[PDB]
């Protein structure tokens with residue numbers, strides 16, 4: 001996604017509390033982008049006796 | 051007994067002491083009405099809850115909400131105000147308050 005975070009001229013990466021990459025900068029366009037995961041949690045089954 | 055009985059005028063079935071209690075404790079964030087994509091927009095300043103969520107640690111809602119708990123309480127108190135202590139064993143039996 002696209003974010004509006006300010007960056008320094010010599011900064012490269014942004015790191016979250018979990019110490020994992022979240023925000024990057026495009027090496028050839030010089031614009032800032034943000035990374036988020038895509039999946040989610042699990043399911044459950046309701047059933048009477050077999 | 052106007053300070054303990056539930057107040058009809060309130061939009062929710064609660065009583066003034068309970069109402070004063072609820073605002074004196076800072077409950078953690080919850081509600082779960084909608085969660086996906088929340089921290090993508092205006093919450094781009096990430097909150098701790100979705101940061102926890104993204105790593106697979108979750109919480110679950112309780113079986114009984116607050117409303118039915120208030121209902122049980124407004125049941126027990128109404129039972130003990132107008133029937134002495136007999137309704138704990140058998141059928142309810144009414145007694146005037148001063149004799150009790």
Ligand SMILES: *[C@@H]1O[C@H](CO)[C@@H](O[C@@H]2O[C@H](CO)[C@@H](O)[C@H](O)[C@H]2NC(C)=O)[C@H](O)[C@H]1NC(C)=O
Nearest residue numbers: 051052053054055056057059065066067069070
């Ligand atoms: C029962 O007691 C409550 C509180 O002591 C009374 O309610 C208050 O009444 C005064 C009037 O003297 C008001 O100024 C307060 O705003 C009331 N407070 C609340 C929380 O209601 C109530 O009037 C009493 N009931 C009777 C029948 O006298």
Ligand SMILES: *[C@@H]1O[C@H](CO)[C@@H](O)[C@H](O)[C@H]1NC(C)=O
Nearest residue numbers: 025026027028029030031032
């Ligand atoms: C090569 O990199 C320069 C430096 O950003 C850029 O201006 C140019 O458009 C790039 N050209 C190609 C063909 O990738």
